[PDB]
PDB file of C-alpha atoms in Angstrom:
ATOM      1  CA  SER V   1     -67.100  18.059  20.196  1.00 11.71           C
ATOM      2  CA  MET V   2     -68.362  16.701  16.825  1.00 13.68           C
ATOM      3  CA  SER V   3     -66.319  13.642  15.808  1.00 12.10           C
ATOM      4  CA  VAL V   4     -63.901  14.339  18.781  1.00 12.76           C
ATOM      5  CA  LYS V   5     -64.449  11.914  21.677  1.00 12.33           C
ATOM      6  CA  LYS V   6     -62.643  11.220  24.963  1.00 12.44           C
ATOM      7  CA  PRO V   7     -61.772   7.494  25.387  1.00 10.46           C
ATOM      8  CA  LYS V   8     -64.805   5.197  26.294  1.00  7.56           C
ATOM      9  CA  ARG V   9     -65.033   4.577  30.152  1.00 10.56           C
ATOM     10  CA  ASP V  10     -66.512   1.063  30.705  1.00  8.54           C
ATOM     11  CA  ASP V  11     -69.965   1.601  32.255  1.00  7.79           C
ATOM     12  CA  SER V  12     -71.343  -1.913  31.731  1.00  9.70           C
ATOM     13  CA  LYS V  13     -71.095  -2.935  35.428  1.00  8.89           C
ATOM     14  CA  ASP V  14     -72.542   0.360  36.803  1.00 11.29           C
ATOM     15  CA  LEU V  15     -76.096  -1.008  37.215  1.00 10.09           C
ATOM     16  CA  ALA V  16     -74.945  -4.018  39.187  1.00 13.99           C
ATOM     17  CA  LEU V  17     -72.550  -2.072  41.298  1.00 16.68           C
ATOM     18  CA  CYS V  18     -75.194   0.694  42.238  1.00 16.80           C
ATOM     19  CA  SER V  19     -77.544  -2.247  43.190  1.00 16.34           C
ATOM     20  CA  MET V  20     -74.865  -3.633  45.481  1.00  9.39           C
ATOM     21  CA  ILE V  21     -74.194  -0.353  47.152  1.00  7.24           C
ATOM     22  CA  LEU V  22     -77.997   0.169  47.601  1.00  8.10           C
ATOM     23  CA  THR V  23     -78.243  -3.354  49.212  1.00  4.17           C
ATOM     24  CA  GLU V  24     -75.557  -2.412  51.664  1.00  3.95           C
ATOM     25  CA  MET V  25     -77.387   0.822  52.532  1.00  2.22           C
ATOM     26  CA  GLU V  26     -80.719  -1.003  52.904  1.00  2.00           C
ATOM     27  CA  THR V  27     -79.202  -3.525  55.377  1.00  2.00           C
ATOM     28  CA  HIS V  28     -77.283  -0.988  57.548  1.00  2.00           C
ATOM     29  CA  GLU V  29     -78.725  -0.709  61.044  1.00  2.00           C
ATOM     30  CA  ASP V  30     -79.211   3.024  60.820  1.00  2.00           C
ATOM     31  CA  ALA V  31     -81.217   2.776  57.519  1.00  2.00           C
ATOM     32  CA  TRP V  32     -84.620   2.629  59.338  1.00  2.00           C
ATOM     33  CA  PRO V  33     -85.566   6.310  58.868  1.00  2.00           C
ATOM     34  CA  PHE V  34     -84.937   5.986  55.123  1.00  2.00           C
ATOM     35  CA  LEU V  35     -86.375   2.635  54.037  1.00  2.00           C
ATOM     36  CA  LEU V  36     -89.833   3.890  53.080  1.00  2.00           C
ATOM     37  CA  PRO V  37     -91.447   7.189  51.963  1.00  2.00           C
ATOM     38  CA  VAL V  38     -92.280   9.612  54.838  1.00  2.00           C
ATOM     39  CA  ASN V  39     -96.048   9.360  55.445  1.00  2.00           C
ATOM     40  CA  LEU V  40     -97.229  12.780  54.300  1.00  2.00           C
ATOM     41  CA  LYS V  41    -100.621  12.353  56.006  1.00  2.00           C
ATOM     42  CA  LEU V  42     -99.041  11.685  59.390  1.00  2.00           C
ATOM     43  CA  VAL V  43     -95.963  13.938  59.546  1.00  2.00           C
ATOM     44  CA  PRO V  44     -96.863  17.613  59.894  1.00  2.00           C
ATOM     45  CA  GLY V  45     -94.714  20.002  57.911  1.00  2.00           C
ATOM     46  CA  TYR V  46     -93.157  17.360  55.559  1.00  2.00           C
ATOM     47  CA  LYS V  47     -95.250  17.876  52.510  1.00  2.00           C
ATOM     48  CA  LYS V  48     -94.823  21.673  52.408  1.00  2.00           C
ATOM     49  CA  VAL V  49     -91.224  21.846  53.472  1.00  2.00           C
ATOM     50  CA  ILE V  50     -89.512  18.987  51.485  1.00  2.00           C
ATOM     51  CA  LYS V  51     -90.031  19.774  47.841  1.00  2.00           C
ATOM     52  CA  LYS V  52     -88.568  16.462  46.600  1.00  2.00           C
ATOM     53  CA  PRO V  53     -89.104  13.524  48.961  1.00  2.00           C
ATOM     54  CA  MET V  54     -86.811  10.491  48.446  1.00  2.00           C
ATOM     55  CA  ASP V  55     -86.242   7.168  50.225  1.00  2.00           C
ATOM     56  CA  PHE V  56     -84.358   3.867  49.556  1.00  2.00           C
ATOM     57  CA  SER V  57     -87.453   1.924  48.359  1.00  2.00           C
ATOM     58  CA  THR V  58     -88.214   4.553  45.732  1.00  2.00           C
ATOM     59  CA  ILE V  59     -84.527   4.587  44.618  1.00  2.00           C
ATOM     60  CA  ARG V  60     -84.688   0.755  44.413  1.00  2.00           C
ATOM     61  CA  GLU V  61     -87.834   0.796  42.181  1.00  2.00           C
ATOM     62  CA  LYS V  62     -86.307   3.574  39.903  1.00  2.00           C
ATOM     63  CA  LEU V  63     -83.058   1.480  39.592  1.00  2.00           C
ATOM     64  CA  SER V  64     -84.974  -1.764  38.809  1.00  2.00           C
ATOM     65  CA  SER V  65     -87.099  -0.092  36.077  1.00  2.00           C
ATOM     66  CA  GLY V  66     -84.380   1.846  34.088  1.00  2.00           C
ATOM     67  CA  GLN V  67     -85.211   5.261  35.421  1.00  2.00           C
ATOM     68  CA  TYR V  68     -81.528   6.213  36.136  1.00  2.00           C
ATOM     69  CA  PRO V  69     -79.823   7.291  32.924  1.00  2.00           C
ATOM     70  CA  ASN V  70     -76.359   7.101  34.531  1.00  2.00           C
ATOM     71  CA  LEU V  71     -74.541   6.621  37.872  1.00  2.00           C
ATOM     72  CA  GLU V  72     -74.601  10.416  38.650  1.00  2.00           C
ATOM     73  CA  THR V  73     -78.397  10.641  38.631  1.00  2.00           C
ATOM     74  CA  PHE V  74     -78.381   7.623  41.053  1.00  2.00           C
ATOM     75  CA  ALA V  75     -75.909   9.438  43.418  1.00  2.00           C
ATOM     76  CA  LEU V  76     -78.104  12.608  43.245  1.00  2.00           C
ATOM     77  CA  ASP V  77     -81.164  10.694  44.594  1.00  2.00           C
ATOM     78  CA  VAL V  78     -79.129   8.998  47.363  1.00  2.00           C
ATOM     79  CA  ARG V  79     -77.707  12.401  48.476  1.00  2.00           C
ATOM     80  CA  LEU V  80     -81.230  13.906  48.304  1.00  2.00           C
ATOM     81  CA  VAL V  81     -82.320  11.380  50.934  1.00  2.00           C
ATOM     82  CA  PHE V  82     -79.625  12.809  53.356  1.00  2.00           C
ATOM     83  CA  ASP V  83     -80.141  16.441  52.432  1.00  2.00           C
ATOM     84  CA  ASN V  84     -83.846  16.106  53.164  1.00  2.00           C
ATOM     85  CA  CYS V  85     -82.994  14.473  56.469  1.00  2.00           C
ATOM     86  CA  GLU V  86     -80.740  17.414  57.395  1.00  2.00           C
ATOM     87  CA  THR V  87     -83.419  19.907  56.371  1.00  2.00           C
ATOM     88  CA  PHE V  88     -86.093  18.416  58.681  1.00  2.00           C
ATOM     89  CA  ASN V  89     -84.185  16.947  61.622  1.00  2.00           C
ATOM     90  CA  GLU V  90     -81.874  18.351  64.299  1.00  2.00           C
ATOM     91  CA  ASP V  91     -78.243  17.041  64.132  1.00  2.00           C
ATOM     92  CA  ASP V  92     -78.667  15.951  67.806  1.00  2.00           C
ATOM     93  CA  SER V  93     -81.631  13.538  67.268  1.00  2.00           C
ATOM     94  CA  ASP V  94     -81.499   9.873  66.523  1.00  2.00           C
ATOM     95  CA  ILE V  95     -82.757  10.467  62.942  1.00  2.00           C
ATOM     96  CA  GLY V  96     -80.344  13.407  62.434  1.00  2.00           C
ATOM     97  CA  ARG V  97     -77.405  11.199  63.539  1.00  2.00           C
ATOM     98  CA  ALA V  98     -78.632   8.283  61.366  1.00  2.00           C
ATOM     99  CA  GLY V  99     -78.495  10.560  58.361  1.00  2.00           C
ATOM    100  CA  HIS V 100     -74.943  11.756  58.977  1.00  2.00           C
ATOM    101  CA  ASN V 101     -73.766   8.195  59.487  1.00  2.00           C
ATOM    102  CA  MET V 102     -75.520   6.873  56.312  1.00  2.00           C
ATOM    103  CA  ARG V 103     -74.144   9.716  54.165  1.00  2.00           C
ATOM    104  CA  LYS V 104     -70.599   8.914  55.368  1.00  2.00           C
ATOM    105  CA  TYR V 105     -71.112   5.246  54.727  1.00  2.00           C
ATOM    106  CA  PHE V 106     -72.439   5.919  51.198  1.00  2.00           C
ATOM    107  CA  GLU V 107     -69.682   8.352  50.223  1.00  2.00           C
ATOM    108  CA  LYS V 108     -66.963   5.872  51.160  1.00  2.00           C
ATOM    109  CA  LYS V 109     -68.551   2.956  49.156  1.00  2.00           C
ATOM    110  CA  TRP V 110     -69.010   5.400  46.249  1.00  2.00           C
ATOM    111  CA  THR V 111     -65.343   6.507  46.233  1.00  2.00           C
ATOM    112  CA  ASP V 112     -64.040   2.976  46.696  1.00  2.00           C
ATOM    113  CA  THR V 113     -66.223   1.537  43.956  1.00  2.00           C
ATOM    114  CA  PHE V 114     -65.861   4.216  41.211  1.00  2.00           C
ATOM    115  CA  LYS V 115     -63.008   6.764  42.036  1.00  2.00           C
TER     116      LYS V 115
END
């Protein structure tokens, strides 16, 4: 509360570490469905159904331009990529499988890096 603060957690490496994690996600072999924004002119349904589209390139631009106020807002956008994937794709499809794999991969790097 006012004049009563928990001890200061060092957050000075967070930017660099989120960049590293993002690089690892971008270079994973199953990242291909997620590298670029879904083409809303060419994919029927996507615009109306997915209220908040997200992809790795868009997360990379936001990270590079100071649009994440902290590491939790970064993790929210990453998870949104996989939540959208689950919303639009069957679990038993190549894209549906890619999404489950990438989420698992992310959550491990996240835990190992920060928890």
